[PDB]
Amino acid sequence: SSYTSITKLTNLTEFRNLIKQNDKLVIDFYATWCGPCKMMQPHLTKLIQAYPDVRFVKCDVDESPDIAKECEVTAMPTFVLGKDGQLIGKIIGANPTALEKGIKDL
Amino acid sequence: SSYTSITKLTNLTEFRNLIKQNDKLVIDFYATWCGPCKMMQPHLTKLIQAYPDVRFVKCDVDESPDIAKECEVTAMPTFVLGKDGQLIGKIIGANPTALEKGIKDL
């Protein structure tokens, strides 16, 4: 499993329910034209494999601007972390060290 | 210089090369029929004068739909910001304050 194959959220119903369904969650809010998002892709693939207990999903902010707005997403990439059926926090930007640290705390 | 005299992007490779060459880049994605793009022209002229260390260009989304598509532009004006050889952010709509604040941070 990798950045390429993880679920991409395309609607609010899916977004909300998948949060509720998961004990540990990372949502990568991204834009396809955005260089820091692209930079983070191989880092996410490594994290996806290193933390198989964590569900990673992704969301294209131009394709799903209603989901991005629900999470009040401004900067790309924004990683929104979920824990026990609930969103708990953000890691903003192409920062693999801070991102891995937040994931380890889940 | 001004809105009228800045480079008008016409090609996808040209757009990519400009992104790589420029430490600081603003692209105005506009449509000629769209009033808010017109309203933003004198604001862009002021910003172009105020930020000589920023390269400003423009792109007609209807004449260059592939470049608009690359940046996922469907609302105009959209201002796409690049820093140090990659695209980093997008400001959507006729919002002079938000635009300057983004430009100021480059």
From Swiss-Prot, chains A, B:
BP terms from Gene Ontology: cellular response to oxidative stress
Disulfide bonds: C34-C37
Active site: C34, C37
Gene Ontology MF terms in the entry: disulfide oxidoreductase activity
A single GO cellular-component term on record: mitochondrion
Domain of life of the source: Eukaryota
Domain spans labelled Thioredoxin: 1-106
Key words of the record: Disulfide bond, Electron transport, Mitochondrion, Redox-active center, Transit peptide, Transport
Positions bearing the site annotation: Contributes to redox potential value: G35, P36
Site (Deprotonates C-terminal active site Cys): D28
Entry's localization field: Mitochondrion
Family: Belongs to the thioredoxin family.
Miscellaneous field: Yeast has two cytoplasmic thioredoxins, TRX1 and TRX2, and one mitochondrial, TRX3.
Protein name: Thioredoxin-3, mitochondrial
Annotated source species: Saccharomyces cerevisiae (strain ATCC 204508 / S288c) (Baker's yeast)
